[PDB]
Structure formats: C-alpha cells, structure tokens
Amino acid sequence: VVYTDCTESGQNLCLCEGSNVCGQGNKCILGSDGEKNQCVTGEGTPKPQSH
C-alpha cells in the first residue's frame, strides 16, 4: 500500500523515516524545533483517513 507522512506526534502507520512506515507499536514524533521525523517504539494513535 502507499501511506502518507504523519501530521501530529505520537501517531503510527505513517511515513517517518523516509518511505519506511512507523510500524505498529511505534509512533512518529514530528520534530518541534528543526528536528526531523523520528519513529520510536512505545504506542501511538493511528492516523485517520484525512485530518
């Protein structure tokens, strides 16, 4: 499937490290401070179809 980037931090199932999806049980922190998209383990909300 083709996925899209994350719009908020603490979301999963979205592109984060490039075309690599932030897999389930991991969530993407959108940088808040010139930082880049960072997918880390934990848990997060699934990105809804359009915000």
From Swiss-Prot:
Annotated S-S bridges: 6-14, 16-28, 22-39
Keyword Disulfide bond: yes
GO biological process terms held by the UniProt record: negative regulation of serine-type peptidase activity
Major subcellular site: secreted
Residues bearing glycans: 45
GO MF term (any one): serine-type endopeptidase inhibitor activity
Keywords (A to Z) from UniProt: Blood coagulation cascade inhibiting toxin, Disulfide bond, Glycoprotein, Hemostasis impairing toxin, Pharmaceutical, Protease inhibitor, Secreted, Serine protease inhibitor, Sulfation, Toxin
Domain of life: Eukaryota
GO cellular component, as recorded: extracellular space
Record's subcellular location: Secreted
Segments for region (Interaction with thrombin active site): 1-3
Outcome following mutation: residue 4 to A: Decreased affinity for thrombin
Family indicated by similarity: Belongs to the protease inhibitor I14 (hirudin) family.
Function as written in the Swiss-Prot or TrEMBL entry: Hirudin is a potent thrombin-specific protease inhibitor. It forms a stable non-covalent complex with alpha-thrombin, thereby abolishing its ability to cleave fibrinogen.
Name the record gives this protein: Hirudin variant-1
